[PDB]
Write a structure and sequence with these properties.
The complex is a heterodimer of chains A (50) and B (45). With 50 residues, chain A is mainly alpha-helical. Chain A is built from 3 helices and no strands. Chain A has a single domain, classed as Creb-binding Protein, Chain: A (Orthogonal Bundle), CATH 1.10.1630.10. The longest helix of chain A is centred in the first third of the chain and has 10 residues. The radius of gyration of chain A is 12 Å and the shape is globular. Chain B starts with 7 loop residues before the first helix and ends in a 6-residue tail after the last helix. Chain B is flat, with a radius of gyration of 13 Å. Classes of the chains: A mainly alpha (50), B mainly alpha (45).
């Protein structure tokens, strides 16, 4: 058994999509919209103050 | 995510490394913006 969800991929897919630094503004809002991704992502993002 | 280590959380977990190549100040604006400090206290949906 090894198959990730499709919904979670959509959220992260946003911040993953190769777009200008401007679109990044959307990523922030997406982070919160991502559960399992929030915890993991926090590692790098939240690391901003680590 | 409960006996997995290969779920969506791990999918971006890799590429996420690129995040390290971003301003630390900018990340703070997005963090405090939504306040992930409390979003990490509980998660389930």
């Amino acid at each position: 058994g090894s198959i990730p969800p499709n919904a979670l991929q959509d959220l992260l897919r946003t911040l993953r999509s190769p777009s200008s630094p401007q679109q990044q503004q959307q990523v922030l809002n997406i982070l919160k919209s991502n559960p399992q991704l929030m915890a993991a992502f926090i590692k790098q993002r939240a690391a901003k103050y680590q | 995510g409960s006996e997995s280590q290969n779920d969506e959380k791990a999918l971006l977990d890799q590429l996420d490394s690129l995040l390290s190549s971003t301003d630390e100040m900018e990340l703070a604006e997005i963090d405090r913006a939504l306040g992930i400090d409390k979003l990490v206290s509980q998660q389930g949906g």
